[PDB]
Amino acid sequence: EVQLQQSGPELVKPGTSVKMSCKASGYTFTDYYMHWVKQSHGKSLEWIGYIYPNNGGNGYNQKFKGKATLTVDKSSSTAYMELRSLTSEDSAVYYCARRGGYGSRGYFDVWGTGTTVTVSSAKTTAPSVYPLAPVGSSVTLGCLVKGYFPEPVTLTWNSGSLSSGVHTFPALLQSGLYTLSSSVTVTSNTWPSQTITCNVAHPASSTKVDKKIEPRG
Amino acid sequence: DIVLTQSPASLAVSLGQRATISCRASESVDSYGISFMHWYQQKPGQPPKLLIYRASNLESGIPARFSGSGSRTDFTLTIIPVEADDVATYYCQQSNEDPRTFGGGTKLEIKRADAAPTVSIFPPSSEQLTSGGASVVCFLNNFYPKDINVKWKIDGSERQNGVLNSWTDQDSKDSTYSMSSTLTLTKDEYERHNSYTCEATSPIVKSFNRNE
């Protein structure tokens, strides 16, 4: 398997710099050109530049000339991109991508896992997690995750053993803070006799919370 | 730069039917008689994945339901038959000259039969009420098409804003959408009224009474 493993999400302050990595495995790193691409939520893809690890040669989109710097560490098979003078226009997903084919005009054959950069002054804030119990054949329960920053959180049901019948809704910003919710629908004979618990993790605050959904009243 | 214009922006296609997506380039992207134009699929929350390279070559491991053709400035991607899990954004991209450039994307949606949402209403949890906030949550699950109206009423009177609505992407199995609608109020304001209703459009209606 060809793998391009990118570094995790960064919350970084306006005007500062951020450096992100792409560790390659499953091929000889120095035989392929590594390119970088920006995707702004979650529409346009834009080509940034490239670097050849074999010899060190590199090139840029004019647009990114004063913004991005590409480097490699050959011994650990890793490409780096550093972005400078950050503004909220730099908030985006960044991909490394390996050039395939035999020449300069090669397509991208493998894309990296993506690094999300959030450019913000705001502080890391742990979510509050609230169980949503009901007020026929099926019952629907919920989980409300309110007041965190930055993205992401991960939300599962019963550690992930309950994945059928789940809808986890995209987070939205309210008052500079994220909120998300999730529903799970099970058969009426399942809960409350069988317990159902929302699991929420927000790595940026090292918080994990399990909330059991209990019958109201 | 070389501009790539895709059409349409959004393509609705029934299961089993053919999808065709166009990409026009503002100049030829041929060199040596070879068209340096590629197609990628991007599923929501996922990195792009190569489908077709050099206009017509099917990438290893991509199903033969996908194909490409064209040359110079005019390219098409075809999916036949379309399957429920082809919902994604499809991107064309030229590599004939620097800088590489991509089209704006085409979103594939699956046309299917209308479906009423299953609607569930949830009062503020008592944990939340202990902190001065009150959010009332309505889930509208498994409906089609995506454009639904959700209305809140407090003691039968309509309310916006404090309303936040979030849709899922189209489900890759049953081609439905779901959405959540959250009404956020102060705890003071929540406890000044008794009757809370969410309505989805004749509308599907869920209510509760705060005292019951």
Ligand SMILES: COc1cc(S(=O)(=O)O)c2ccc3c(S(=O)(=O)O)cc(S(=O)(=O)O)c4ccc1c2c43
């Ligand atoms: C007539 O010249 C041909 C022919 C082929 S062929 O295999 O499709 O016939 C090519 C197939 C693939 C080519 C590739 S690819 O492997 O990176 O896709 C690049 C170039 S390039 O312009 O030197 O970058 C080429 C330049 C000229 C090329 C071809 C490529």
Ligand SMILES: [Zn+2]
């Ligand atoms: Zn131009």
Ligand SMILES: [Zn+2]
């Ligand atoms: Zn040209």
Ligand SMILES: [Zn+2]
């Ligand atoms: Zn569903």
Ligand SMILES: [Zn+2]
């Ligand atoms: Zn009032």
Ligand SMILES: [Zn+2]
């Ligand atoms: Zn009232």
Ligand SMILES: [Zn+2]
């Ligand atoms: Zn009653």
